[PDB]
Amino acid sequence: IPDRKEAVISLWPEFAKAIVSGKKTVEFRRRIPLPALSARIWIYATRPVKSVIGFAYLEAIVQGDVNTLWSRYGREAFLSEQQYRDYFEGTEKATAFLLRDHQPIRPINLDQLKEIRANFQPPQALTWLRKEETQKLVSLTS
Ligand SMILES: [Cl-]
Ligand SMILES: [Cl-]
Ligand SMILES: [Cl-]
């Protein structure tokens, strides 16, 4: 049973790159199941990259009102007010993940990930990694 110190998240490639390059230090999600505070977040870029391209660490978790969060962290989130607004339409509470110590790596493609976890689907929210899985992911890291 995973302890949520190791997790994977899915982003579109432009946002995934902004993160592994240290540009985007905030990720907004709805109220989803939470990682551990001290977690490594491995960053999975969707099509056409279809790879894990780095990781980053979680310096803080913020939940609160949608307007407040944009006002406070929206610039660090690298998306536009419109995108944020369309996404959080229909809810009043958001989650902000504050990120630090980003690390670009060379891409671990989707085939290698199904080699580590047989039925890997790219996470709609976060997926927690097993111990055995983390070791393999790390082994491929470069
Ligand atoms: Cl959701
Ligand atoms: Cl709500
Ligand atoms: Cl709620």
Residue numbers in the entry: 4 to 145
Direct quotes from the study:
In the ethanologenic bacterium Zymomonas mobilis ZM4, the gene ZMO0922 encodes a 148 amino acid polypeptide, which has been annotated as a putative ASCH domain-containing protein (ZmASCH) that belongs to family 23. Here, we report the three-dimensional crystal structure of ZmASCH which confirms the fold of a central β-barrel core and reveals a positively-charged cleft with a pocket on the surface. In vitro assays showed that ZmASCH bound nucleic acids and possessed cleavage activity specifically towards single-stranded RNAs. The weak nuclease activity of ZmASCH depended on magnesium ions and the protein appeared to prefer the consecutive pyrimidine-adenine dinucleotides for its cleavage activity.
The bases of the bound ssRNA interact with the side-chain atoms of Arg32, Tyr90, Lys117, Gln124, and Ser128. Although these residues are not conserved in ZmASCH at the same site, potential polar residues (Asn122, Gln124, Gln127, and Ser128), which might possibly interact with RNA molecules, are found nearby (right). Based on these simulation results and extensive analysis of amino acid sequences of related proteins, we introduced a charge-reversal mutation at the site of Lys53 (K53E), within the positively charged surface cleft. This mutant exhibited reduced binding to ssDNA and ssRNA molecules. Another mutation at Ser128 (S128A) also decreased the binding of ZmASCH to nucleic acids, although to a lesser degree. Mutations of the two independent residues at the positions of 47 and 128 did not make a noticeable structural change.
